[PDB]
Ligand binder design. Structure first.
Ligand SMILES: O=C(c1cccc(F)c1)N1CCNCC1
Lengths: 39, 154
C-alpha cells in the first residue's frame, strides 16, 4: 500500500551543480514502454 | 490529505522498513508520476486517498485526482535542471544540457544523469521552474551509465 510525503518546492536554483553530457542516440520504444538502443 | 504543489516521495511499507519506490509532482490538485513506480495502484496522503485518473503504459505515465496538467516542453537549446529526490536524501537540483533520443516517431530530449531506481518520477524543469517532463524511463549505454528520456504527457 503506497503513500506520499512532501519533499520540497519545484523551483529552478541559480548556481546548482552543473554535470552530465548530451549524447545523441537512436532509440526504439516498444509496446511495454521500454526504450532500447538501435545500431 | 496533503495537496500543496511540489515534489513528493512515493513510499511503501510492504518490504523491509519504509522503501522509496519513486517520486511525483503535485500540481493543480493532480499528482503526476511514472507508471512503473505505482503500477496504477491507489495512493495515500495522510488519511486521504488518491485514485488514478489517467494512465498509459506506453508513455509510462499516470495522473491521480484529475487529468495530466504538465504541458511545458524542452526548447531544444537550453540547459534544464533535474530536481532529483533520491531515497533517504534531500531534494537536490542538478543542471545539465540534454542530449536527444532519436526515434522513428520523432526526437525527444534526454538527460544523462544516473540515480537510484527509486528516484524515478523526479521532475525536470526549465529556467522558469516549469516541469517539462519526468525522469526515470530510458536506456543504458556501453559505459554502463544511464540516459533517461525527458518524458512529458502526450
Ligand atoms: O490526463 C489526460 C492527459 C494525458 C496526457 C496529456 C494530457 F494533456 C492529458 N487525459 C485523461 C482525460 N482526457 C484525455 C487525456
Amino acid at each position: 500500500d503506497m503513500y506520499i510525503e512532501r519533499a520540497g518546492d519545484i523551483t529552478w536554483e541559480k548556481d546548482a551543480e552543473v554535470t552530465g553530457n548530451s549524447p545523441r542516440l537512436d532509440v526504439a520504444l516498444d509496446e511495454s514502454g521500454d526504450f532500447s538502443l538501435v545500431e | 490529505g496533503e495537496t500543496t504543489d511540489g515534489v513528493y516521495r512515493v513510499m511503501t511499507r510492504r518490504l523491509l522498513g519504509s522503501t522509496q519506490v519513486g517520486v511525483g509532482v503535485m500540481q493543480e490538485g493532480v499528482f503526476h508520476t511514472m507508471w512503473h513506480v505505482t503500477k496504477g495502484a491507489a495512493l495515500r496522503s495522510g488519511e486521504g486517498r488518491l485514485d488514478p485518473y489517467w494512465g498509459d503504459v506506453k508513455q509510462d505515465l499516470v495522473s491521480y485526482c484529475g487529468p495530466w496538467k504538465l504541458d511545458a516542453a524542452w526548447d531544444g537549446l537550453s540547459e534544464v535542471q533535474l530536481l532529483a529526490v533520491p531515497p533517504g536524501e534531500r531534494a537536490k537540483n542538478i543542471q545539465t544540457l540534454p542530449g536527444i533520443f532519436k526515434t522513428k516517431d520523432g526526437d525527444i530530449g534526454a538527460v544523462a544523469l544516473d540515480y537510484p531506481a527509486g528516484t524515478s518520477g523526479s521532475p525536470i524543469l526549465d529556467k522558469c521552474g516549469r516541469v517539462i517532463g519526468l525522469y526515470g524511463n530510458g536506456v543504458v549505454i556501453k559505459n554502463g551509465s544511464y540516459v533517461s528520456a525527458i518524458t512529458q504527457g502526450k
